[PDB]
Every structure is written in structure tokens, then in C-alpha cells.
């Protein structure tokens, strides 16, 4: 898992970033401080990130092959 | 007064502009959405304009030489 682990954290880094970006453009909407059409692209990236992380997470997990049943 | 009148209106135009700029940046520095150094500059210009306008107004007014006393 050297890599899957790398990607998974490389991702989370990203999400943590875009997620802040979004949340900020949000509160800053009710001030024109952030247009409605921008808090769109920002929330766009945020959703993509959130998706990448879930995929990375999924792959990393498959890295540890588990046994489906109890037996021999 | 062709010119004094021109300058005065040339000024007022300016003030109306910078004034808006200021009033706006104010509510935007109140959201960290704008540098603190910037809003300062904006209110700087606004003040300069307001000053310019007053001087223009004064000069225009002197364009009409009135009589100080009643007499002959």
C-alpha cells in the first residue's frame, strides 16, 4: 500500500483545502463578497474532492484482503 | 466660470465614485474578504475626493463677486 496510502492522503489534503474554500465562499455569499455563480465552482471542486477521497479510501481498504467467512 | 464649473462637476463625479468604493469595501473588510490595508486606501481616496469637491465648490462660488456692503 505504499501508494494507495499516498494517494489517500494526497486526496484528503485536497478536500481539506477545497472544503474550506467552499464554506468560506458560502458565508461570504450574503455580502456579494462572494457571488452565487462562484460559490458554485467552489462547491463544485469541494464535491469532486469529497468524491476522490472516498475512492482513495475505498482502494486503500482493499489493500488489506480480509476473509469473508470463518473456517479453514 | 466655464472651468471652475467644469472642475467642480469633474470633482463631484470623482467623489460619487470613490465614496461608493469606500462604503462597499467597508462591509467587505468586515468579512476579512478584503485586506485591511486596502480598505484604508479606499477610505483615503474617499476623503481626498470629499476635500477636492469642497475646494471646487468654494472656487466656483467666488466666481460671483458679491457686494459686501449696501451703499453706492
PDB file of C-alpha atoms in Angstrom:
ATOM      1  CA  UNK A   1       0.000   0.000   0.000  1.00  0.00           C
ATOM      2  CA  UNK A   2       2.818   2.499  -0.209  1.00  0.00           C
ATOM      3  CA  UNK A   3       0.956   4.352  -2.979  1.00  0.00           C
ATOM      4  CA  UNK A   4      -2.711   3.822  -2.216  1.00  0.00           C
ATOM      5  CA  UNK A   5      -1.806   5.260   1.176  1.00  0.00           C
ATOM      6  CA  UNK A   6      -0.034   8.157  -0.518  1.00  0.00           C
ATOM      7  CA  UNK A   7      -2.938   8.893  -2.821  1.00  0.00           C
ATOM      8  CA  UNK A   8      -5.431   8.653   0.021  1.00  0.00           C
ATOM      9  CA  UNK A   9      -3.607  11.285   1.987  1.00  0.00           C
ATOM     10  CA  UNK A  10      -2.782  13.294  -1.063  1.00  0.00           C
ATOM     11  CA  UNK A  11      -6.538  13.410  -1.594  1.00  0.00           C
ATOM     12  CA  UNK A  12      -7.642  14.278   1.962  1.00  0.00           C
ATOM     13  CA  UNK A  13      -5.169  17.169   1.806  1.00  0.00           C
ATOM     14  CA  UNK A  14      -7.042  18.474  -1.207  1.00  0.00           C
ATOM     15  CA  UNK A  15     -10.567  18.023   0.221  1.00  0.00           C
ATOM     16  CA  UNK A  16      -9.491  19.769   3.445  1.00  0.00           C
ATOM     17  CA  UNK A  17      -8.414  22.652   1.179  1.00  0.00           C
ATOM     18  CA  UNK A  18     -11.370  22.984  -1.180  1.00  0.00           C
ATOM     19  CA  UNK A  19     -13.767  22.330   1.692  1.00  0.00           C
ATOM     20  CA  UNK A  20     -12.509  25.439   3.471  1.00  0.00           C
ATOM     21  CA  UNK A  21     -12.640  27.410   0.190  1.00  0.00           C
ATOM     22  CA  UNK A  22     -16.300  26.458  -0.250  1.00  0.00           C
ATOM     23  CA  UNK A  23     -17.503  27.025   3.337  1.00  0.00           C
ATOM     24  CA  UNK A  24     -15.936  30.473   3.092  1.00  0.00           C
ATOM     25  CA  UNK A  25     -17.397  31.493  -0.271  1.00  0.00           C
ATOM     26  CA  UNK A  26     -20.703  30.370   1.286  1.00  0.00           C
ATOM     27  CA  UNK A  27     -20.991  32.628   4.331  1.00  0.00           C
ATOM     28  CA  UNK A  28     -19.427  35.292   2.117  1.00  0.00           C
ATOM     29  CA  UNK A  29     -22.317  34.980  -0.358  1.00  0.00           C
ATOM     30  CA  UNK A  30     -24.793  37.071   1.652  1.00  0.00           C
ATOM     31  CA  UNK A  31     -22.470  40.046   1.073  1.00  0.00           C
ATOM     32  CA  UNK A  32     -21.786  39.782  -2.654  1.00  0.00           C
ATOM     33  CA  UNK A  33     -18.374  39.241  -1.050  1.00  0.00           C
ATOM     34  CA  UNK A  34     -18.888  36.007  -2.932  1.00  0.00           C
ATOM     35  CA  UNK A  35     -21.196  35.806  -5.928  1.00  0.00           C
ATOM     36  CA  UNK A  36     -23.730  32.985  -6.282  1.00  0.00           C
ATOM     37  CA  UNK A  37     -22.010  31.918  -9.527  1.00  0.00           C
ATOM     38  CA  UNK A  38     -18.616  31.467  -7.849  1.00  0.00           C
ATOM     39  CA  UNK A  39     -19.776  29.687  -4.695  1.00  0.00           C
ATOM     40  CA  UNK A  40     -20.865  27.344  -7.481  1.00  0.00           C
ATOM     41  CA  UNK A  41     -17.425  26.499  -8.922  1.00  0.00           C
ATOM     42  CA  UNK A  42     -16.044  26.388  -5.387  1.00  0.00           C
ATOM     43  CA  UNK A  43     -18.756  23.988  -4.198  1.00  0.00           C
ATOM     44  CA  UNK A  44     -18.075  22.130  -7.433  1.00  0.00           C
ATOM     45  CA  UNK A  45     -14.437  21.401  -6.569  1.00  0.00           C
ATOM     46  CA  UNK A  46     -15.423  20.641  -2.982  1.00  0.00           C
ATOM     47  CA  UNK A  47     -17.790  17.896  -4.176  1.00  0.00           C
ATOM     48  CA  UNK A  48     -15.223  16.438  -6.568  1.00  0.00           C
ATOM     49  CA  UNK A  49     -12.600  16.306  -3.810  1.00  0.00           C
ATOM     50  CA  UNK A  50     -15.042  14.672  -1.429  1.00  0.00           C
ATOM     51  CA  UNK A  51     -15.542  12.063  -4.164  1.00  0.00           C
ATOM     52  CA  UNK A  52     -11.821  11.442  -4.810  1.00  0.00           C
ATOM     53  CA  UNK A  53     -11.224  10.910  -1.109  1.00  0.00           C
ATOM     54  CA  UNK A  54     -13.986   8.320  -0.890  1.00  0.00           C
ATOM     55  CA  UNK A  55     -12.495   6.492  -3.846  1.00  0.00           C
ATOM     56  CA  UNK A  56      -8.964   6.623  -2.401  1.00  0.00           C
ATOM     57  CA  UNK A  57     -10.326   5.442   0.919  1.00  0.00           C
ATOM     58  CA  UNK A  58     -12.061   2.525  -0.833  1.00  0.00           C
ATOM     59  CA  UNK A  59      -8.892   1.441  -2.633  1.00  0.00           C
ATOM     60  CA  UNK A  60      -6.692   1.650   0.432  1.00  0.00           C
ATOM     61  CA  UNK A  61      -9.146  -0.528   2.304  1.00  0.00           C
ATOM     62  CA  UNK A  62      -8.993  -3.255  -0.338  1.00  0.00           C
ATOM     63  CA  UNK A  63      -5.249  -3.283   0.315  1.00  0.00           C
ATOM     64  CA  UNK A  64      -5.910  -5.416   3.425  1.00  0.00           C
ATOM     65  CA  UNK A  65      -7.502  -8.571   1.965  1.00  0.00           C
ATOM     66  CA  UNK A  66      -9.858  -9.950   4.637  1.00  0.00           C
ATOM     67  CA  UNK A  67     -11.510 -13.371   4.988  1.00  0.00           C
ATOM     68  CA  UNK A  68     -15.258 -13.390   4.165  1.00  0.00           C
ATOM     69  CA  UNK A  69     -16.095 -16.489   6.205  1.00  0.00           C
ATOM     70  CA  UNK A  70     -14.864 -18.222   9.351  1.00  0.00           C
ATOM     71  CA  UNK A  71     -13.429 -21.635   8.595  1.00  0.00           C
ATOM     72  CA  UNK A  72     -10.375 -23.420   7.285  1.00  0.00           C
TER      73      UNK A  72
ATOM     74  CA  UNK B   1     -16.849  80.226 -14.742  1.00  0.00           C
ATOM     75  CA  UNK B   2     -16.736  77.815 -17.639  1.00  0.00           C
ATOM     76  CA  UNK B   3     -13.844  75.949 -15.992  1.00  0.00           C
ATOM     77  CA  UNK B   4     -14.458  76.314 -12.264  1.00  0.00           C
ATOM     78  CA  UNK B   5     -17.895  74.902 -13.045  1.00  0.00           C
ATOM     79  CA  UNK B   6     -16.222  72.139 -15.038  1.00  0.00           C
ATOM     80  CA  UNK B   7     -13.786  71.265 -12.291  1.00  0.00           C
ATOM     81  CA  UNK B   8     -16.478  71.278  -9.662  1.00  0.00           C
ATOM     82  CA  UNK B   9     -18.549  68.765 -11.598  1.00  0.00           C
ATOM     83  CA  UNK B  10     -15.467  66.888 -12.620  1.00  0.00           C
ATOM     84  CA  UNK B  11     -14.771  66.527  -8.916  1.00  0.00           C
ATOM     85  CA  UNK B  12     -18.263  65.599  -7.710  1.00  0.00           C
ATOM     86  CA  UNK B  13     -18.149  62.794 -10.270  1.00  0.00           C
ATOM     87  CA  UNK B  14     -14.993  61.528  -8.636  1.00  0.00           C
ATOM     88  CA  UNK B  15     -16.348  61.751  -5.081  1.00  0.00           C
ATOM     89  CA  UNK B  16     -19.537  59.900  -6.031  1.00  0.00           C
ATOM     90  CA  UNK B  17     -17.249  57.162  -7.358  1.00  0.00           C
ATOM     91  CA  UNK B  18     -14.700  56.810  -4.531  1.00  0.00           C
ATOM     92  CA  UNK B  19     -17.489  57.239  -1.990  1.00  0.00           C
ATOM     93  CA  UNK B  20     -19.251  54.167  -3.321  1.00  0.00           C
ATOM     94  CA  UNK B  21     -15.926  52.292  -3.423  1.00  0.00           C
ATOM     95  CA  UNK B  22     -15.354  53.077   0.256  1.00  0.00           C
ATOM     96  CA  UNK B  23     -18.847  52.311   1.587  1.00  0.00           C
ATOM     97  CA  UNK B  24     -18.553  48.965  -0.171  1.00  0.00           C
ATOM     98  CA  UNK B  25     -15.054  47.894   0.916  1.00  0.00           C
ATOM     99  CA  UNK B  26     -16.154  48.681   4.465  1.00  0.00           C
ATOM    100  CA  UNK B  27     -18.704  45.830   4.575  1.00  0.00           C
ATOM    101  CA  UNK B  28     -16.089  43.647   2.885  1.00  0.00           C
ATOM    102  CA  UNK B  29     -13.240  44.189   5.315  1.00  0.00           C
ATOM    103  CA  UNK B  30     -15.901  43.283   7.885  1.00  0.00           C
ATOM    104  CA  UNK B  31     -15.623  39.768   6.411  1.00  0.00           C
ATOM    105  CA  UNK B  32     -11.858  39.533   6.011  1.00  0.00           C
ATOM    106  CA  UNK B  33     -12.865  39.342   2.334  1.00  0.00           C
ATOM    107  CA  UNK B  34     -10.519  42.303   1.747  1.00  0.00           C
ATOM    108  CA  UNK B  35      -7.068  43.263   3.045  1.00  0.00           C
ATOM    109  CA  UNK B  36      -7.097  45.704   5.960  1.00  0.00           C
ATOM    110  CA  UNK B  37      -4.530  47.826   4.119  1.00  0.00           C
ATOM    111  CA  UNK B  38      -6.858  48.089   1.141  1.00  0.00           C
ATOM    112  CA  UNK B  39      -9.972  49.380   2.897  1.00  0.00           C
ATOM    113  CA  UNK B  40      -7.734  52.030   4.424  1.00  0.00           C
ATOM    114  CA  UNK B  41      -6.597  53.185   0.993  1.00  0.00           C
ATOM    115  CA  UNK B  42     -10.199  53.215  -0.211  1.00  0.00           C
ATOM    116  CA  UNK B  43     -11.277  55.480   2.615  1.00  0.00           C
ATOM    117  CA  UNK B  44      -8.181  57.547   1.933  1.00  0.00           C
ATOM    118  CA  UNK B  45      -9.259  58.317  -1.621  1.00  0.00           C
ATOM    119  CA  UNK B  46     -12.783  58.935  -0.472  1.00  0.00           C
ATOM    120  CA  UNK B  47     -11.552  61.597   1.917  1.00  0.00           C
ATOM    121  CA  UNK B  48      -9.314  63.246  -0.630  1.00  0.00           C
ATOM    122  CA  UNK B  49     -12.219  63.457  -3.091  1.00  0.00           C
ATOM    123  CA  UNK B  50     -14.536  64.925  -0.493  1.00  0.00           C
ATOM    124  CA  UNK B  51     -11.843  67.560   0.093  1.00  0.00           C
ATOM    125  CA  UNK B  52     -11.345  68.322  -3.602  1.00  0.00           C
ATOM    126  CA  UNK B  53     -15.072  68.799  -4.039  1.00  0.00           C
ATOM    127  CA  UNK B  54     -15.206  71.296  -1.233  1.00  0.00           C
ATOM    128  CA  UNK B  55     -12.411  73.352  -2.671  1.00  0.00           C
ATOM    129  CA  UNK B  56     -14.010  73.262  -6.136  1.00  0.00           C
ATOM    130  CA  UNK B  57     -17.304  74.318  -4.643  1.00  0.00           C
ATOM    131  CA  UNK B  58     -15.583  77.212  -2.882  1.00  0.00           C
ATOM    132  CA  UNK B  59     -13.855  78.481  -6.026  1.00  0.00           C
ATOM    133  CA  UNK B  60     -16.976  78.261  -8.112  1.00  0.00           C
ATOM    134  CA  UNK B  61     -18.833  80.303  -5.522  1.00  0.00           C
ATOM    135  CA  UNK B  62     -16.235  83.095  -5.683  1.00  0.00           C
ATOM    136  CA  UNK B  63     -16.982  83.274  -9.411  1.00  0.00           C
ATOM    137  CA  UNK B  64     -19.892  85.579  -8.491  1.00  0.00           C
ATOM    138  CA  UNK B  65     -18.306  88.646  -6.906  1.00  0.00           C
ATOM    139  CA  UNK B  66     -20.910  89.946  -4.411  1.00  0.00           C
ATOM    140  CA  UNK B  67     -21.080  93.359  -2.711  1.00  0.00           C
ATOM    141  CA  UNK B  68     -20.028  93.376   0.978  1.00  0.00           C
ATOM    142  CA  UNK B  69     -21.955  96.481   1.970  1.00  0.00           C
ATOM    143  CA  UNK B  70     -25.152  98.255   0.963  1.00  0.00           C
ATOM    144  CA  UNK B  71     -24.362 101.661  -0.411  1.00  0.00           C
ATOM    145  CA  UNK B  72     -23.335 103.495  -3.528  1.00  0.00           C
TER     146      UNK B  72
END
